[PDB]
Amino acid sequence: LLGWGLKQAEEANKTPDKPDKVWRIQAGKGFNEFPNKEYDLYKSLLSSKIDGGWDWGNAATHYWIKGGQWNKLEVDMKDAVGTYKLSGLRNFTGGDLDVNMQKATLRLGQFNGNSFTSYKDSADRTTRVDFNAKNILIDNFLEINNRVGSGAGRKASSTVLTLQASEGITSSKNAEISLYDGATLNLASNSVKLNGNVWMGRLQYVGAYLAPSYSTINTSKVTGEVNFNHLTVGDHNAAQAGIIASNKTHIGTLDLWQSAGLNIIAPPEGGYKQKTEVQPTQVIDGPFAGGKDTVVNIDRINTKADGTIKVGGFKASLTTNAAHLNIGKGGVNLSNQASGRTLLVENLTGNITVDGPLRVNNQVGGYALAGSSANFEFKAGVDTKNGTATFNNDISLGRFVNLKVDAHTANFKGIDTGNGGFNTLDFSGVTNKVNINKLITASTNVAVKNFNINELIVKTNGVSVGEYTHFSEDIGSQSRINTVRLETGTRSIFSGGVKFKSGEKLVIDEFYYSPWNYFDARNIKNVEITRKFASSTPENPWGTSKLMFNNLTLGQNAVMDYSQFSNLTIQGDFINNQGTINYLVRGGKVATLNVGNAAAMMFNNDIDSATGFYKPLIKINSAQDLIKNTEHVLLKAKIIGYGNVSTGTNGISNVNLEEQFKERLALYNNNNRMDTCVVRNTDDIKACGMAIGNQSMVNNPDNYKYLIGKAWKNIGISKTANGSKISVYYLGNSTPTENGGNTTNLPTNT
């Protein structure tokens, strides 16, 4: 209930005990002349001053030192050479072993495990069990602060194991290290590689599911390569483990519990270091900052999760002070019961780099039910706010799973939420940048303040409605989406789609329509389009595409495919820059463009070598069935404020602006232009005669010589450029005269 940061700090600085009867045992001659003799410790040496017994009250074995558990002993070999074993010291109560074994290989496992526990007296004693071997090689299971008898009898107080080898502490596969409610241990060798089931926190008794049950593996002195293999924190209780490592922690499979915590704490920057009565100074530490080269390579996070149902989840958590929290190819698992199991992958003052697939219930998709809201959560650099949470692997979310990241810069590579839906994809803590590479949504609750998703896929929701892409907060000013590609929805109903809630600008480069998926763009006032603005099926469109805007702007060279199949609706000041909007008829009728407030336009001296004239400013392609002698509404307008970069293009002139607007438009038929026909030599005579359908330009190119760097307007096509309408009066495909009129020159400024 106090927390682990108080508990490890208050047992970091204690006086050991007050033991009377300090026994001293020295191994003399005989041990120090056989380097491979394979001795024992208990029967050969330690059973002299360690007595067995029976605890009255549900015991199996019982061991203390001499005449009670309050007597220090020691073993001082310092030259004994060989190899040894403990092999069966179970339910040791004792107190203050310190087996000093220089140049002596140890082995705490042979045919039987071990145990080290204290009793809960009125003196509140520890054990402080030390070893100072050369190698250790645990090689069988070991319990620290275990259950001495069976529930009843005497209770168990705290303890300390300390293993201070000089060459390395390996372990065997069946060596389940399992320290309990009050136990700690320290290691001091180099290159500890525990290949066994490390078990921090266990049920000390049979049914006490509400114990605090702290632990500690403080491998502070390890100068080599710490390498755990298989941890397990918590067992049917709210254990709060902690590890104070030595800035390199490669572990393997991690098996947390539901309500289990973990605190991997990297070292600091320079490394570690009738009368009044005065208690000693209790120096405490808050959550500090790890050093620069602090690496914690947790390469698999599983979770055990079963049991009852509480009103919330349980929120397993690991807290890391390291400047890196790399998570490799194993990825993150999440076992999920009927309620919502949650994990917290938190980093205080570091980074997080996950390169693995986020699973749940041990599959990649991982559907969850309504009450089981599995909640992924990542915190990269909380107390420094410069920490990045880079996910260099394509994640995959099912249904009722919720990613949230509260970092400084959350880079990504791909997000899959369109398969399951109901995914709160929160980003509310992100400072400045979100680099999502690919997004797939069905019913998502995206909340980003600033991003640039360079490619966006918005899928539908099958056939049911109420499920859609939803940006639920302000999108900001530096936001951007380089590619939006909606896919074709369901039949005759806008079931899937996008909607916004706030924002002011969203610089889009490229867009695709889709039938029956709506691109609602609420409240954003500067929706820019930079390049091609077409549909997902540009060859054979159908359906409708609700582009329910409030404002939009189109820049240079952004071609459009505007038809009756896309009701582009504007409620604001549409500004068109040098962009060639193309039209199509789909049955002879020209699809008018419905401007709500204003369609202001402004252009350039956009002359090119493709024509010799300016760019075709508005084209109408595939209008072969264009209805003659009938007003074709080209675009609806309310205020046409037309201009160019100056009064006159190609420098400056005094020409009124609206008349050369009619020059740059195009009516594209027979693979050429019918509005004008820009003819520069004798070769495009043939193409112009293909356009107008006359044999006067087919057989003889010298028939018409008004066109050496010139052009001519076809009469029968009338265009309005006033302040309220842009219309087309297609009434004649007239044969042009040679020297009678309706002819222009070229600007000749390519």
Side-chain angles (χ1 to χ4, degrees), residues 458-468 486-498 514-519 542-546 567:
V458 177
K459 290 178 70 68
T460 186
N461 47 2
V463 295
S464 65
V465 298
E467 296 178 356
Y468 53 89
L486 282 77
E487 59 92 21
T488 65
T490 183
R491 179 72 267 172
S492 70
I493 183 166
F494 286 92
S495 295
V498 184
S514 68
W516 301 102
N517 284 320
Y518 62 98
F519 184 72
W542 57 273
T544 56
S545 299
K546 289 194 289 183
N567 49 4

mmCIF file of all heavy atoms in Angstrom, residues 458-468 486-498 514-519 542-546 567:
data_model
loop_
_atom_site.group_PDB
_atom_site.id
_atom_site.type_symbol
_atom_site.label_atom_id
_atom_site.label_comp_id
_atom_site.label_asym_id
_atom_site.label_seq_id
_atom_site.Cartn_x
_atom_site.Cartn_y
_atom_site.Cartn_z
ATOM 1 N N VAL A 458 -9.226 5.368 -46.087
ATOM 2 C CA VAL A 458 -10.437 5.391 -45.280
ATOM 3 C C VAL A 458 -11.362 4.320 -45.837
ATOM 4 O O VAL A 458 -11.960 4.487 -46.905
ATOM 5 C CB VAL A 458 -11.102 6.767 -45.274
ATOM 6 C CG1 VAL A 458 -12.400 6.710 -44.487
ATOM 7 C CG2 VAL A 458 -10.151 7.787 -44.685
ATOM 8 N N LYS A 459 -11.472 3.210 -45.118
ATOM 9 C CA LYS A 459 -12.363 2.140 -45.523
ATOM 10 C C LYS A 459 -13.731 2.336 -44.881
ATOM 11 O O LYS A 459 -13.894 3.066 -43.901
ATOM 12 C CB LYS A 459 -11.765 0.783 -45.166
ATOM 13 C CG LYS A 459 -10.562 0.412 -46.006
ATOM 14 C CD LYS A 459 -9.986 -0.921 -45.576
ATOM 15 C CE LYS A 459 -10.914 -2.063 -45.944
ATOM 16 N NZ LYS A 459 -10.995 -2.243 -47.418
ATOM 17 N N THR A 460 -14.732 1.673 -45.443
ATOM 18 C CA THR A 460 -16.090 1.741 -44.937
ATOM 19 C C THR A 460 -16.260 0.743 -43.796
ATOM 20 O O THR A 460 -15.310 0.104 -43.339
ATOM 21 C CB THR A 460 -17.105 1.495 -46.059
ATOM 22 O OG1 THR A 460 -18.431 1.712 -45.561
ATOM 23 C CG2 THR A 460 -16.989 0.074 -46.604
ATOM 24 N N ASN A 461 -17.498 0.617 -43.339
ATOM 25 C CA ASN A 461 -17.862 -0.133 -42.146
ATOM 26 C C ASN A 461 -18.826 -1.259 -42.489
ATOM 27 O O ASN A 461 -19.762 -1.562 -41.747
ATOM 28 C CB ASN A 461 -18.456 0.840 -41.144
ATOM 29 C CG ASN A 461 -19.471 1.756 -41.786
ATOM 30 O OD1 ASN A 461 -19.746 1.631 -42.972
ATOM 31 N ND2 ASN A 461 -20.028 2.680 -41.018
ATOM 32 N N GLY A 462 -18.607 -1.891 -43.636
ATOM 33 C CA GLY A 462 -19.522 -2.906 -44.113
ATOM 34 C C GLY A 462 -20.818 -2.300 -44.608
ATOM 35 O O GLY A 462 -20.821 -1.539 -45.579
ATOM 36 N N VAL A 463 -21.925 -2.622 -43.944
ATOM 37 C CA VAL A 463 -23.228 -2.093 -44.324
ATOM 38 C C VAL A 463 -23.883 -1.271 -43.221
ATOM 39 O O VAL A 463 -24.723 -0.411 -43.532
ATOM 40 C CB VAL A 463 -24.177 -3.221 -44.784
ATOM 41 C CG1 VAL A 463 -23.658 -3.865 -46.060
ATOM 42 C CG2 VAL A 463 -24.340 -4.268 -43.691
ATOM 43 N N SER A 464 -23.537 -1.496 -41.957
ATOM 44 C CA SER A 464 -24.108 -0.724 -40.865
ATOM 45 C C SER A 464 -23.529 0.684 -40.854
ATOM 46 O O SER A 464 -22.448 0.937 -41.394
ATOM 47 C CB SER A 464 -23.847 -1.412 -39.526
ATOM 48 O OG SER A 464 -22.462 -1.449 -39.237
ATOM 49 N N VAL A 465 -24.262 1.605 -40.240
ATOM 50 C CA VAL A 465 -23.879 3.007 -40.204
ATOM 51 C C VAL A 465 -23.543 3.396 -38.768
ATOM 52 O O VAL A 465 -23.629 2.591 -37.841
ATOM 53 C CB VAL A 465 -24.972 3.922 -40.783
ATOM 54 C CG1 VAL A 465 -25.210 3.596 -42.241
ATOM 55 C CG2 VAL A 465 -26.254 3.779 -39.983
ATOM 56 N N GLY A 466 -23.153 4.657 -38.593
ATOM 57 C CA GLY A 466 -22.696 5.136 -37.307
ATOM 58 C C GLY A 466 -21.237 4.874 -37.028
ATOM 59 O O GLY A 466 -20.765 5.179 -35.927
ATOM 60 N N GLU A 467 -20.509 4.322 -37.992
ATOM 61 C CA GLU A 467 -19.110 3.958 -37.836
ATOM 62 C C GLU A 467 -18.311 4.636 -38.940
ATOM 63 O O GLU A 467 -18.577 4.412 -40.125
ATOM 64 C CB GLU A 467 -18.944 2.442 -37.900
ATOM 65 C CG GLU A 467 -19.627 1.684 -36.788
ATOM 66 C CD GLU A 467 -19.458 0.188 -36.933
ATOM 67 O OE1 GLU A 467 -18.875 -0.248 -37.949
ATOM 68 O OE2 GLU A 467 -19.916 -0.553 -36.042
ATOM 69 N N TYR A 468 -17.331 5.447 -38.554
ATOM 70 C CA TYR A 468 -16.709 6.379 -39.484
ATOM 71 C C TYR A 468 -15.385 6.858 -38.908
ATOM 72 O O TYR A 468 -15.113 6.719 -37.714
ATOM 73 C CB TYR A 468 -17.649 7.557 -39.782
ATOM 74 C CG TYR A 468 -18.169 8.262 -38.543
ATOM 75 C CD1 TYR A 468 -17.468 9.314 -37.963
ATOM 76 C CD2 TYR A 468 -19.366 7.869 -37.953
ATOM 77 C CE1 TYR A 468 -17.937 9.940 -36.833
ATOM 78 C CE2 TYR A 468 -19.845 8.497 -36.823
ATOM 79 C CZ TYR A 468 -19.125 9.537 -36.270
ATOM 80 O OH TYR A 468 -19.593 10.173 -35.143
ATOM 81 N N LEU A 486 -9.894 7.309 -50.578
ATOM 82 C CA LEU A 486 -11.094 6.616 -50.147
ATOM 83 C C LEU A 486 -11.359 5.426 -51.064
ATOM 84 O O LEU A 486 -11.044 5.444 -52.256
ATOM 85 C CB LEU A 486 -12.303 7.554 -50.157
ATOM 86 C CG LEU A 486 -12.568 8.597 -49.069
ATOM 87 C CD1 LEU A 486 -11.684 9.811 -49.234
ATOM 88 C CD2 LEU A 486 -14.028 9.014 -49.086
ATOM 89 N N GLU A 487 -11.945 4.380 -50.493
ATOM 90 C CA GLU A 487 -12.310 3.198 -51.254
ATOM 91 C C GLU A 487 -13.825 3.136 -51.379
ATOM 92 O O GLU A 487 -14.555 3.746 -50.593
ATOM 93 C CB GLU A 487 -11.748 1.918 -50.614
ATOM 94 C CG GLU A 487 -12.196 1.656 -49.187
ATOM 95 C CD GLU A 487 -13.437 0.792 -49.097
ATOM 96 O OE1 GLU A 487 -13.734 0.080 -50.076
ATOM 97 O OE2 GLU A 487 -14.114 0.829 -48.050
ATOM 98 N N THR A 488 -14.279 2.383 -52.380
ATOM 99 C CA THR A 488 -15.686 2.368 -52.762
ATOM 100 C C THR A 488 -16.535 1.708 -51.684
ATOM 101 O O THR A 488 -16.318 0.545 -51.329
ATOM 102 C CB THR A 488 -15.858 1.627 -54.085
ATOM 103 O OG1 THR A 488 -15.509 0.248 -53.907
ATOM 104 C CG2 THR A 488 -14.942 2.223 -55.143
ATOM 105 N N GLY A 489 -17.517 2.448 -51.173
ATOM 106 C CA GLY A 489 -18.292 1.986 -50.040
ATOM 107 C C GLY A 489 -19.355 0.962 -50.371
ATOM 108 O O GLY A 489 -19.205 0.162 -51.299
ATOM 109 N N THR A 490 -20.445 0.984 -49.613
ATOM 110 C CA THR A 490 -21.526 0.028 -49.777
ATOM 111 C C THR A 490 -22.589 0.634 -50.681
ATOM 112 O O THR A 490 -22.461 1.763 -51.162
ATOM 113 C CB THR A 490 -22.116 -0.382 -48.422
ATOM 114 O OG1 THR A 490 -23.122 -1.383 -48.617
ATOM 115 C CG2 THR A 490 -22.712 0.817 -47.717
ATOM 116 N N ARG A 491 -23.649 -0.130 -50.915
ATOM 117 C CA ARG A 491 -24.631 0.243 -51.921
ATOM 118 C C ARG A 491 -25.604 1.275 -51.367
ATOM 119 O O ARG A 491 -26.225 1.058 -50.320
ATOM 120 C CB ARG A 491 -25.381 -0.994 -52.404
ATOM 121 C CG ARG A 491 -26.453 -0.731 -53.452
ATOM 122 C CD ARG A 491 -25.859 -0.387 -54.814
ATOM 123 N NE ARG A 491 -25.704 1.050 -55.021
ATOM 124 C CZ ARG A 491 -25.067 1.587 -56.054
ATOM 125 N NH1 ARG A 491 -24.518 0.807 -56.977
ATOM 126 N NH2 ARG A 491 -24.984 2.904 -56.170
ATOM 127 N N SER A 492 -25.720 2.403 -52.070
ATOM 128 C CA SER A 492 -26.768 3.416 -51.959
ATOM 129 C C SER A 492 -26.848 4.106 -50.602
ATOM 130 O O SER A 492 -27.876 4.732 -50.314
ATOM 131 C CB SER A 492 -28.162 2.853 -52.284
ATOM 132 O OG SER A 492 -28.613 1.953 -51.283
ATOM 133 N N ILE A 493 -25.814 4.037 -49.765
ATOM 134 C CA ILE A 493 -25.815 4.738 -48.485
ATOM 135 C C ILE A 493 -24.381 5.075 -48.089
ATOM 136 O O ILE A 493 -23.465 4.260 -48.244
ATOM 137 C CB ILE A 493 -26.558 3.918 -47.398
ATOM 138 C CG1 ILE A 493 -26.622 4.674 -46.067
ATOM 139 C CG2 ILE A 493 -26.009 2.498 -47.265
ATOM 140 C CD1 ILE A 493 -27.608 4.088 -45.090
ATOM 141 N N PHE A 494 -24.183 6.313 -47.628
ATOM 142 C CA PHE A 494 -22.912 6.762 -47.057
ATOM 143 C C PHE A 494 -22.784 6.175 -45.655
ATOM 144 O O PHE A 494 -23.180 6.771 -44.652
ATOM 145 C CB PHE A 494 -22.840 8.283 -47.034
ATOM 146 C CG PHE A 494 -22.616 8.904 -48.380
ATOM 147 C CD1 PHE A 494 -23.684 9.300 -49.165
ATOM 148 C CD2 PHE A 494 -21.331 9.077 -48.867
ATOM 149 C CE1 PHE A 494 -23.472 9.869 -50.409
ATOM 150 C CE2 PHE A 494 -21.111 9.653 -50.103
ATOM 151 C CZ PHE A 494 -22.182 10.040 -50.878
ATOM 152 N N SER A 495 -22.220 4.971 -45.592
ATOM 153 C CA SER A 495 -22.108 4.280 -44.314
ATOM 154 C C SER A 495 -20.774 4.575 -43.633
ATOM 155 O O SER A 495 -20.732 4.842 -42.427
ATOM 156 C CB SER A 495 -22.303 2.778 -44.519
ATOM 157 O OG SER A 495 -23.614 2.487 -44.963
ATOM 158 N N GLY A 496 -19.675 4.515 -44.383
ATOM 159 C CA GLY A 496 -18.381 4.924 -43.884
ATOM 160 C C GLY A 496 -18.006 6.310 -44.389
ATOM 161 O O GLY A 496 -18.533 6.800 -45.382
ATOM 162 N N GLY A 497 -17.084 6.944 -43.676
ATOM 163 C CA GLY A 497 -16.635 8.257 -44.091
ATOM 164 C C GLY A 497 -15.758 8.916 -43.049
ATOM 165 O O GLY A 497 -15.365 8.312 -42.048
ATOM 166 N N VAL A 498 -15.462 10.186 -43.319
ATOM 167 C CA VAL A 498 -14.576 11.011 -42.506
ATOM 168 C C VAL A 498 -15.392 12.193 -42.010
ATOM 169 O O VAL A 498 -16.205 12.731 -42.764
ATOM 170 C CB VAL A 498 -13.372 11.518 -43.329
ATOM 171 C CG1 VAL A 498 -12.388 12.288 -42.473
ATOM 172 C CG2 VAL A 498 -12.696 10.387 -44.048
ATOM 173 N N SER A 514 -14.564 8.415 -53.912
ATOM 174 C CA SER A 514 -15.138 7.077 -53.878
ATOM 175 C C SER A 514 -16.647 7.215 -53.868
ATOM 176 O O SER A 514 -17.172 8.160 -53.269
ATOM 177 C CB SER A 514 -14.689 6.294 -52.642
ATOM 178 O OG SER A 514 -15.238 6.867 -51.473
ATOM 179 N N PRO A 515 -17.371 6.304 -54.509
ATOM 180 C CA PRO A 515 -18.826 6.290 -54.345
ATOM 181 C C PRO A 515 -19.214 5.818 -52.953
ATOM 182 O O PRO A 515 -18.675 4.834 -52.438
ATOM 183 C CB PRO A 515 -19.298 5.312 -55.427
ATOM 184 C CG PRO A 515 -18.117 4.446 -55.694
ATOM 185 C CD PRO A 515 -16.916 5.327 -55.510
ATOM 186 N N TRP A 516 -20.116 6.586 -52.336
ATOM 187 C CA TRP A 516 -20.821 6.228 -51.101
ATOM 188 C C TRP A 516 -19.878 6.128 -49.900
ATOM 189 O O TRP A 516 -20.062 5.304 -49.002
ATOM 190 C CB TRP A 516 -21.641 4.950 -51.284
ATOM 191 C CG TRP A 516 -22.647 5.110 -52.364
ATOM 192 C CD1 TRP A 516 -22.567 4.625 -53.635
ATOM 193 C CD2 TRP A 516 -23.856 5.873 -52.301
ATOM 194 N NE1 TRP A 516 -23.672 5.007 -54.357
ATOM 195 C CE2 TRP A 516 -24.478 5.777 -53.560
ATOM 196 C CE3 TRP A 516 -24.479 6.614 -51.296
ATOM 197 C CZ2 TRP A 516 -25.694 6.393 -53.840
ATOM 198 C CZ3 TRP A 516 -25.689 7.227 -51.573
ATOM 199 C CH2 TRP A 516 -26.284 7.112 -52.834
ATOM 200 N N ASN A 517 -18.864 6.993 -49.889
ATOM 201 C CA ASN A 517 -18.112 7.314 -48.678
ATOM 202 C C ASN A 517 -17.886 8.818 -48.673
ATOM 203 O O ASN A 517 -17.351 9.366 -49.641
ATOM 204 C CB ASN A 517 -16.773 6.573 -48.600
ATOM 205 C CG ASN A 517 -16.925 5.116 -48.216
ATOM 206 O OD1 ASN A 517 -17.732 4.766 -47.355
ATOM 207 N ND2 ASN A 517 -16.118 4.260 -48.830
ATOM 208 N N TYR A 518 -18.286 9.478 -47.591
ATOM 209 C CA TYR A 518 -18.357 10.932 -47.536
ATOM 210 C C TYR A 518 -17.073 11.507 -46.955
ATOM 211 O O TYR A 518 -16.563 11.013 -45.944
ATOM 212 C CB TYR A 518 -19.574 11.389 -46.722
ATOM 213 C CG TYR A 518 -19.583 10.977 -45.266
ATOM 214 C CD1 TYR A 518 -19.163 11.852 -44.272
ATOM 215 C CD2 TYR A 518 -20.059 9.728 -44.882
ATOM 216 C CE1 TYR A 518 -19.182 11.483 -42.943
ATOM 217 C CE2 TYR A 518 -20.079 9.349 -43.556
ATOM 218 C CZ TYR A 518 -19.642 10.230 -42.591
ATOM 219 O OH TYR A 518 -19.664 9.856 -41.267
ATOM 220 N N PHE A 519 -16.540 12.531 -47.618
ATOM 221 C CA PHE A 519 -15.378 13.264 -47.126
ATOM 222 C C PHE A 519 -15.868 14.586 -46.541
ATOM 223 O O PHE A 519 -15.769 15.648 -47.153
ATOM 224 C CB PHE A 519 -14.361 13.465 -48.245
ATOM 225 C CG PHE A 519 -13.085 14.122 -47.800
ATOM 226 C CD1 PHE A 519 -12.167 13.427 -47.027
ATOM 227 C CD2 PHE A 519 -12.788 15.422 -48.177
ATOM 228 C CE1 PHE A 519 -10.987 14.024 -46.618
ATOM 229 C CE2 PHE A 519 -11.612 16.026 -47.772
ATOM 230 C CZ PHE A 519 -10.710 15.325 -46.993
ATOM 231 N N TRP A 542 -19.098 6.195 -60.793
ATOM 232 C CA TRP A 542 -20.521 6.045 -60.506
ATOM 233 C C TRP A 542 -20.758 6.497 -59.070
ATOM 234 O O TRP A 542 -19.819 6.844 -58.348
ATOM 235 C CB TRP A 542 -20.996 4.604 -60.719
ATOM 236 C CG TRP A 542 -20.257 3.598 -59.906
ATOM 237 C CD1 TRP A 542 -19.095 2.971 -60.246
ATOM 238 C CD2 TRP A 542 -20.632 3.079 -58.625
ATOM 239 N NE1 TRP A 542 -18.717 2.103 -59.254
ATOM 240 C CE2 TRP A 542 -19.645 2.149 -58.247
ATOM 241 C CE3 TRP A 542 -21.705 3.312 -57.759
ATOM 242 C CZ2 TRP A 542 -19.698 1.453 -57.041
ATOM 243 C CZ3 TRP A 542 -21.752 2.622 -56.561
ATOM 244 C CH2 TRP A 542 -20.757 1.704 -56.214
ATOM 245 N N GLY A 543 -22.024 6.491 -58.661
ATOM 246 C CA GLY A 543 -22.381 6.863 -57.307
ATOM 247 C C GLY A 543 -22.203 8.351 -57.048
ATOM 248 O O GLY A 543 -22.098 9.172 -57.957
ATOM 249 N N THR A 544 -22.182 8.689 -55.761
ATOM 250 C CA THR A 544 -21.959 10.053 -55.304
ATOM 251 C C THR A 544 -20.863 10.069 -54.248
ATOM 252 O O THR A 544 -20.594 9.059 -53.591
ATOM 253 C CB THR A 544 -23.238 10.682 -54.727
ATOM 254 O OG1 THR A 544 -23.742 9.861 -53.668
ATOM 255 C CG2 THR A 544 -24.309 10.850 -55.799
ATOM 256 N N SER A 545 -20.228 11.231 -54.092
ATOM 257 C CA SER A 545 -19.149 11.413 -53.119
ATOM 258 C C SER A 545 -19.381 12.747 -52.421
ATOM 259 O O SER A 545 -19.083 13.800 -52.989
ATOM 260 C CB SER A 545 -17.786 11.383 -53.797
ATOM 261 O OG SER A 545 -17.561 10.139 -54.430
ATOM 262 N N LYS A 546 -19.898 12.705 -51.191
ATOM 263 C CA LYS A 546 -20.178 13.940 -50.465
ATOM 264 C C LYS A 546 -18.903 14.627 -50.002
ATOM 265 O O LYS A 546 -18.296 14.227 -49.005
ATOM 266 C CB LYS A 546 -21.076 13.691 -49.255
ATOM 267 C CG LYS A 546 -22.507 13.356 -49.586
ATOM 268 C CD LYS A 546 -23.367 13.480 -48.344
ATOM 269 C CE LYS A 546 -23.093 12.367 -47.359
ATOM 270 N NZ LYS A 546 -23.991 12.458 -46.176
ATOM 271 N N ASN A 567 -20.623 15.643 -55.754
ATOM 272 C CA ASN A 567 -21.187 16.940 -55.405
ATOM 273 C C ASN A 567 -20.229 17.742 -54.528
ATOM 274 O O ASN A 567 -20.381 17.804 -53.304
ATOM 275 C CB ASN A 567 -22.567 16.763 -54.754
ATOM 276 C CG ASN A 567 -22.580 15.725 -53.642
ATOM 277 O OD1 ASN A 567 -21.552 15.162 -53.290
ATOM 278 N ND2 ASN A 567 -23.759 15.470 -53.084
#
